[PDB]
């Protein structure tokens, strides 16, 4: 019955063996943000950036990488709330999909998808991206880039997200750093429209002060314990 909007960050996929920029270093897989997550870095060294996400994409599909209990808990939450549930993620992994979630809004794109340089059309891509690859949507074909939103680019599905933010009875942010905007500002927006805000995190986010309710610790145990408590709450 209550409308629930869930925002997830890199923290929820950390226990599954997927790492992304850390606090102390400010490095992603020992790379600078600016070199692997900007339009400029891609224009400077297309070969390196393409190879970077080639590594990330094939690491994602290793047998050792599995959705953890936090991913699974959110899947059960959708089963219970039906279409009164919306999952928005900053992650480019597919662990929400593997866990059983559907209609997940990837505001920062997906690692298992690529995009045509000029057409903007999106293609499913599981293998490596090579210089020998072009599009089949244009009469004059074009180079392929990862379908990932870089810093300086516009996030995806923003219209649908803000619409859901104003409708949500309960807003839950999971594994978010609070450093990446506009995603970190979502908790604000949710409160103006009267939503109850909850933060579930291993590391308390910088905007954690904001949230009405907080719980901290490993996601695979904090998230299921909150989801299970929310489910029994609605009987």
């Amino acid at each position: 019955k209550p409308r629930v909007l869930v925002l997830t960050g890199a923290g929820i996929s950390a226990e599954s063996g997927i790492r992304t920029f850390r606090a102390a270093d400010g490095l992603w897989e020992e790379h600078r943000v600016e070199d692997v997550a900007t339009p400029e870095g891609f224009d400077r060294d297309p070969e390196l950036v393409q190879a970077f996400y080639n590594a990330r994409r094939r690491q994602l599909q290793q047998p050792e990488i599995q959705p953890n209990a936090a991913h699974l808990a959110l899947a059960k939450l959708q089963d219970a709330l039906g279409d009164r549930f919306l999952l928005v993620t900053q992650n480019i992994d597919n662990l929400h999909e593997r866990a059983g979630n559907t209609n997940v809004i990837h505001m920062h794109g997906e690692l298992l998808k690529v995009r045509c340089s000029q057409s903007g059309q999106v293609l499913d891509w599981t293998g490596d991206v090579t210089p020998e690859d072009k599009c089949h949507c244009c009469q004059f074909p074009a180079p392929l880039r990862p379908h990932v939103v870089w810093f300086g680019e516009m996030p995806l599905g923003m219209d649908e997200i803000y619409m859901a933010l104003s409708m949500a009875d309960i807003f839950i942010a999971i594994g978010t750093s609070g450093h990446v905007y506009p995603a970190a500002g979502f908790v604000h927006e949710a409160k103006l429209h009267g939503a109850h805000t909850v933060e579930l995190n291993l590391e308390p986010s910088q905007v954690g002060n904001e949230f009405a309710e907080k719980y901290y610790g490993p996601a695979s145990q904090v998230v299921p314990e909150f989801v299970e408590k929310l489910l029994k709450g609605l009987k």
């Binding site: 870089w150 810093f151 300086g152 996030p155 990446v180 506009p182």
Partner: peptide
Amino acid sequence: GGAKRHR
């Protein structure tokens, strides 16, 4: 809204 940004 705006574009993806840090800080």
